[PDB]
Structure 1
């Protein structure tokens, strides 16, 4: 300012506005706190859900599609002992789909080589990794892990 009344005008204009802006800053920061707490309470489940949906869509993109048949075609490797449980998972999926007419799980004569699986446990994981470090054993050859 240049004059006493100008000085008083500016002084009042800033004295109201500073308190107003501090008030809004503090309340909006409290709003940040509330909404960010609400987000953090659930983000992990949100992360898991979005990642699961991503995985589901990506794996679905491996099937053959309406270009071949309106129903999808897929192919899987599985341990034999769990065929019943896999069919039960298929049953669960169809139940969630709500269709009366059911799905089907099919065996077939195969030319591709089976993978190797070991049903590792907490104690033997390190040793199984140690023997895997030099090449995984062929289907059903003796595992050096239990002796190592």
Structure 2
């Protein structure tokens, strides 16, 4: 009866019936799915006993079509998460194939733990393995319904947080050793320096240098456990975790601005490419793509043995915009730094006239 009510509800939605004693329906349908509807409609009218087959006329109007996405049991959770903010228009690039990986990845960097990564995915594999008998029961409160709707989202969240939990140890804030700890060079610091007088008294928590005999090899997979047992732990981590956060922030936003090209080269609108893709990828490489290569350059160049007076990336990012160059507090990071940086700002400066003034010529 609930089917028959639905068919009689959509026949109310059907033709004004003024034209003939027949029903006309302007339905939307996928173009590549068109053989299956015609094969069904040809035998659908056969059950009624009619010798007249119903026909399907294709229109060429200008009403806006709806969107449609091929939806699986897995990618439905990542689809409606994107669809909650805004429905996609006709033939825009769906970010949902990219949201499958990047959104559990961006969750895992800010929720990174091996121990909580175990807890998240073991709850997740319980939700998907027993999912037949859980779905058999009708309906429950909102702390089971949204959780069951995202059982595959929380699966990839628990898997990736195990991996990013290995990049920075942090298994219930504890750590593991996999053929490592090769920073903590005890002997060399004290053997090559003074051992016992220093053990108690003047120092209770004294620092290690890296250039006596101490640091050999940077822990082949993750953060070495010597930081977690130290007391200066955060000043290395907040130096690390702030740089990598803006490293991931650019190349994710660079990946977004490169997809604006494929939304303009498909519409055959070459006007939009010459002010939308070209100056935007120059504006982000000059200001922000230059920032991520300064993080890589400072990381490899300077070390513990030389260069205690190492420059800071906060001040040198300011001297790009506030054009004052020449100071003794912060040295240049590399030779010819004054010449390349003024060139990078003016080509970021003139992009704002180039984007603005040349597009309204329509």
- TM-score, length of structure 1 as denominator length: 0.63
The answer as to whether partners of 1:64 and 1:74 remain within 8 angstroms in 2 is yes
**Structure 1 residues 97 and 65 mapped into 2: Cα distance closer, same or farther (>3 Å)?**
farther
| Alpha-carbon distance in 1 for matches of 2:51, 2:12 | 25
Instruction: For residue 121 of structure 1, report the CA deviation from its aligned partner.
Output: 0.8
| Alpha-carbon distance in 2 for matches of 1:74, 1:105 | 10
Instruction: For residue 66 of structure 1, report the CA deviation from its aligned partner.
Output: 3.9
The answer as to whether partners of 1:65 and 1:71 remain within 8 angstroms in 2 is no
Residues 112-139 of structure 1, C-alpha deviations (whole Å, 9 max, x = no match): 1111111111111111111001101111
Instruction: For residue 92 of structure 1, report the CA deviation from its aligned partner.
Output: 2.1
Are 1:78 and 2:29 an aligned pair? Answer: yes
- Alpha-carbon RMSD: 1.2
Are 1:113 and 2:29 an aligned pair? Answer: no
Pairing partner for 2:46 from 95, 102, 115: 95
Are 1:125 and 2:76 an aligned pair? Answer: yes
Paired positions, count: 99
Q: Secondary structure at the match of 2:58?
A: coil
| Alpha-carbon distance in 2 for matches of 1:66, 1:138 | 32
**Structure 1 residues 111 and 120 mapped into 2: Cα distance closer, same or farther (>3 Å)?**
same
- TM-score, length of structure 2 as denominator length: 0.27
The answer as to whether partners of 1:115 and 1:139 remain within 8 angstroms in 2 is yes
Alignment of 1:3-22 (within 5 A): none
| Alpha-carbon distance in 2 for matches of 1:131, 1:101 | 45
Are 1:137 and 2:88 an aligned pair? Answer: yes
Structure 2 unaligned spans of 5+:
100-362
